[PDB]
Every structure is written in structure tokens, then in C-alpha cells.
Design an enzyme around this catalytic site. Structure first.
Site, short mmCIF file in Angstrom:
data_model
loop_
_atom_site.label_atom_id
_atom_site.label_comp_id
_atom_site.label_asym_id
_atom_site.label_seq_id
_atom_site.Cartn_x
_atom_site.Cartn_y
_atom_site.Cartn_z
N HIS A 11 -5.44 7.30 -2.78
CA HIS A 11 -7.05 6.61 -2.44
C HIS A 11 -6.20 5.57 -1.56
O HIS A 11 -7.36 5.42 -0.52
CB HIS A 11 -7.65 5.77 -3.92
N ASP A 12 -5.28 5.59 -1.24
CA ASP A 12 -4.25 4.83 0.32
C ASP A 12 -3.41 5.89 0.85
O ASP A 12 -2.54 5.13 1.30
CB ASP A 12 -3.89 3.57 -0.47
N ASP A 46 -7.95 -0.44 -8.04
CA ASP A 46 -7.40 -1.15 -6.51
C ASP A 46 -7.22 -1.90 -6.94
O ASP A 46 -6.03 -3.10 -6.87
CB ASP A 46 -8.82 -1.05 -5.70
N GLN A 69 -5.63 -17.71 -2.96
CA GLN A 69 -6.04 -16.60 -4.98
C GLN A 69 -6.90 -17.38 -5.87
O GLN A 69 -8.24 -15.73 -5.99
CB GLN A 69 -4.40 -16.25 -5.39
N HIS A 127 2.02 1.84 -5.60
CA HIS A 127 -0.08 1.30 -5.55
C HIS A 127 -0.38 2.22 -5.93
O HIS A 127 -1.05 1.82 -6.98
CB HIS A 127 0.07 0.76 -4.59
N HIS A 162 0.86 -0.95 0.53
CA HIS A 162 -0.13 -0.38 -0.41
C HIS A 162 0.75 1.35 -0.08
O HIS A 162 0.81 2.33 0.27
CB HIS A 162 -1.16 0.41 1.28
C1 IWC Z 1 -10.27 -16.78 2.02
C2 IWC Z 1 -8.87 -16.79 1.38
C3 IWC Z 1 -7.41 -17.89 1.77
C4 IWC Z 1 -6.29 -16.73 1.70
N1 IWC Z 1 -5.13 -17.98 1.32
C5 IWC Z 1 -3.90 -16.90 0.98
C6 IWC Z 1 -3.25 -18.02 2.27
C7 IWC Z 1 -4.26 -18.66 2.92
C8 IWC Z 1 -5.17 -19.22 2.50
N2 IWC Z 1 -5.98 -15.85 0.14
C9 IWC Z 1 -7.68 -14.97 0.03
C10 IWC Z 1 -7.37 -14.08 -0.58
C11 IWC Z 1 -6.65 -12.82 -0.74
C12 IWC Z 1 -6.66 -11.69 -1.21
C13 IWC Z 1 -7.35 -10.73 -0.71
C14 IWC Z 1 -6.78 -9.25 -1.24
C15 IWC Z 1 -6.14 -9.54 -2.36
C16 IWC Z 1 -5.84 -8.55 -3.20
C17 IWC Z 1 -4.98 -8.26 -4.52
C18 IWC Z 1 -4.76 -9.21 -5.17
C19 IWC Z 1 -4.52 -10.52 -3.77
C20 IWC Z 1 -5.38 -10.49 -2.75
N3 IWC Z 1 -5.82 -11.70 -2.26
N4 IWC Z 1 -9.17 -15.14 0.59
MG MG Z 2 -7.62 1.23 0.22
ZN ZN Z 3 -5.67 0.66 -2.53
#
Ligand code: IWC
Ligand code: MG
Ligand code: ZN
Length: 313
Positions: free
Chosen positions: A106-107, A217, A269, A72, A68
Site C-alpha cells: 500500500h506504501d 494503516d 494528537q 510499516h 513509511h
Molecule cells: C492539526 C494537527 C496538528 C498536529 N500537531 C503536531 C504538532 C503541532 C500540531 N498534529 C496533527 C495530526 C497529526 C497526525 C497525522 C497523521 C497521523 C497518523 C498516524 C498517527 C499519528 C498521526 N498524527 N494535526
Molecule cells: Mg500511504
Molecule cells: Zn501506510
């Protein structure tokens, strides 16, 4: 007035593409943003002296956090620039002005922690802003910088046009609260399918801009695979640090934030791509057909994460 920003040939060509990476040279990023402002908005939109002083104050107020950060801010602004350039006639002058600035800001002053961690820590900002905690702070920082002497880039707008643009920026920055994305896209999905979506309806324009802000974003997932993969490291560096801090409060973090559960990241992912990313760029492509390349790149990256799970990389 006649002072145009010009990039090297490769950047001049690739900056127009959705999947552009702004590169590792920090000192080029301001020029890259000014370039985009001039082409997206016009050379006359901002006094160059005020714009350059605004940009450098914004940069100073982003922290040295893994994800962040200042890179970004400029990356998100570029995704917005590619959306506006591919949708030339769909957006007003105020909107193109506001939205590039909104993305850059935004951040602002992000600490690398989620609204949830601020709440459980009992951070002062959680007392001042109960919902969209960090995003209300980001807008507050934006107003603060606009009110620094010589920093008011909107000075030549009339009182009503100044209020309109600051309202576009506020809604734009609040939209980047991912908690609010899910409802916003559902409402847009309904409006598109029932055919009641009307771009002259201000309430509908707000929702569409909201989804654009989510699209920009999250645009890490719309890059060529090597960029998406290496950006993921920075993203998880912040998540695992927040997980550590949750463990210090005596709270087991969600597996997403637990560095002991790195093995689970590839499946995590897939969930994110199917539950957040793919839906977001699908609705965006429905409303703005020329943004199709974000959806296509996103699907390409979904397939790369599936190949990681299958042990092919
Ligand atoms: C339920 C769950 C489990 C998880 N694992 C990671 C390892 C263990 C479980 N990752 C996510 C999502 C992550 C995420 C969030 C925002 C994001 C924003 C941008 C790019 C990727 C992102 N990825 N959700
Ligand atoms: Mg933000
Ligand atoms: Zn952002």
C-alpha cells in the site's frame, strides 16, 4: 506443500492479537507475513517460491525513510490479518488473498512526503496522478512487481479472478489516501444508522474494505502505549522533514509539520484521535463487532495523550 512456517511460542500467541508489535528483527518479518498468509488464506493460496520472491522485491522497493518503510508495510498487513482472522466467514477467498498483499504493497516506494508536498513541489507524479498521487503510484509499483518474471503470485487464478483480485488491491490501496477516508466513513455511518448497509452489495463491500484499510494503516494508534509513543517519533520525523522542504519552497508549513512547534504535538494528537482515529475504529466496530479491541486500544492511547498534556508524563 507440507512446509509450514512456525514462530516462537510468544509470537505464535501474540501475533493473533490486534496490538502485536512485529519486533526489531527485520529478517523475521517475511516469515511473519508468510505465516499470516498461510493461516489467513491457506498454504495453497500462493506457490511459496513465487510468494517469497514477490515479498523480497516488495521489500527492496520500500525506502529507508523514518516511518513509511518496510516495517510499516508488514505492520499494516498484520492489522489486516487480525481483522480477517476475527471475521472468519465474512470475506471471500479472493478478498483474503488480495487484502494481505494490498497492505504489504500500500506504501510501495514512499519518499516520506504527502500528496500536498508533491503538488507544491510540482513533482512529475503530481502531473501523472492529479488526486491520490502517491496511492496511484503505490498500486502502479504493485502491478510492476507482479509482472516481474516469477513474481506473479496470482498465476493459478482465472483471467476474471485475476482481474477481480487486482481490482480489490487497487481500491484497497486508493482507500489508504486519508483525503478519501472522511467521506467514506460518513457514507458508512449513514448506511449503518439507516440500516441500508448490505454486505452482498459490492459498492458497500468496497466502502467497508476502504475503512478496514484506513483502520490497518492508522493501527500505530491501537498498540500498547510505549509502541504508539515511539512510533509517533518516526511519524513526526517524516512530518518535520516535509515541513523543512516546505520552508525551502518559501511556504510556511502547517504546525503539524513545523519542528519549531513540537510543544503543540500532544494537542495535535488529541485532534487526530477525535477527528480521524476514534471515528474510524467506532464505525469499524459497528460494522465488524469483533474489531472492538482496536477501538478500546485507541481510546486507551487517547487517554495517554491527555495525561501528557496534563504533565503527568
Ligand atoms: C492539526 C494537527 C496538528 C498536529 N500537531 C503536531 C504538532 C503541532 C500540531 N498534529 C496533527 C495530526 C497529526 C497526525 C497525522 C497523521 C497521523 C497518523 C498516524 C498517527 C499519528 C498521526 N498524527 N494535526
Ligand atoms: Mg500511504
Ligand atoms: Zn501506510
Amino acid at each position: 506443500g507440507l512446509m509450514q512456517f512456525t514462530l516462537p511460542v510468544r509470537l505464535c500467541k501474540e501475533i493473533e492479537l490486534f496490538h502485536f508489535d512485529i519486533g526489531p528483527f527485520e529478517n523475521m518479518w517475511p516469515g511473519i507475513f508468510v505465516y499470516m498468509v498461510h493461516r489467513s488464506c491457506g498454504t495453497s493460496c500462493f506457490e511459496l517460491e513465487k510468494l517469497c520472491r514477490f515479498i523480497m522485491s516488495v521489500k527492496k522497493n520500500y525506502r529507508r525513510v523514518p516511518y513509511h518503510n518496510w516495517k510499516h508495510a508488514v505492520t499494516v498487513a498484520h492489522c489486516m490479518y487480525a481483522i480477517l482472522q476475527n471475521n472468519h466467514t465474512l470475506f471471500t477467498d479472493l478478498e483474503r488473498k488480495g487484502l494481505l498483499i494490498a497492505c504489504l504493497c500500500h506504501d510501495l516506494d514512499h519518499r516520506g512526503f504527502s500528496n500536498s508536498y508533491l503538488q507544491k513541489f510540482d513533482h512529475p507524479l503530481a502531473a501523472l496522478y492529479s488526486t491520490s498521487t502517491m496511492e496511484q503510484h503505490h498500486f502502479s509499483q504493485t502491478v510492476s512487481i507482479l509482472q516481474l518474471e516469477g513474481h506473479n503470485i496470482f498465476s493459478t487464478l482465472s483471467s476474471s479472478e485475476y482481474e477481480q483480485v487486482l481490482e480489490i488491491i487497487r481500491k484497497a490501496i486508493i482507500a489508504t489516501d486519508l483525503a478519501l477516508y472522511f467521506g467514506n466513513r460518513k457514507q458508512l455511518e449513514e448506511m449503518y444508522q439507516t440500516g441500508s448497509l448490505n454486505l452482498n452489495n459490492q459498492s458497500h463491500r468496497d466502502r467497508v474494505i476502504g475503512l478496514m484499510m484506513t483502520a490497518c494503516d492508522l493501527c500505530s494508534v491501537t498498540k500498547l502505549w510505549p509502541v504508539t509513543k515511539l512510533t509517533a517519533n518516526d511519524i513526526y520525523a517524516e512530518f518535520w522533514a516535509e515541513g523543512d522542504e516546505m520552508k525551502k519552497l518559501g511556504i510556511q508549513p502547517i504546525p503539524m509539520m513545523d519542528r519549531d512547534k513540537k510543544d503543540e504535538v500532544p494537542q495535535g494528537q488529541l485532534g487526530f484521535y477525535n477527528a480521524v482515529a476514534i471515528p474510524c475504529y467506532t464505525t469499524l466496530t459497528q460494522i465488524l463487532p469483533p474489531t472492538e479491541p482496536l477501538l478500546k486500544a485507541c481510546r486507551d492511547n487517547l487517554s495517554q495523550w491527555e495525561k501528557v498534556i496534563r504533565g503527568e508524563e
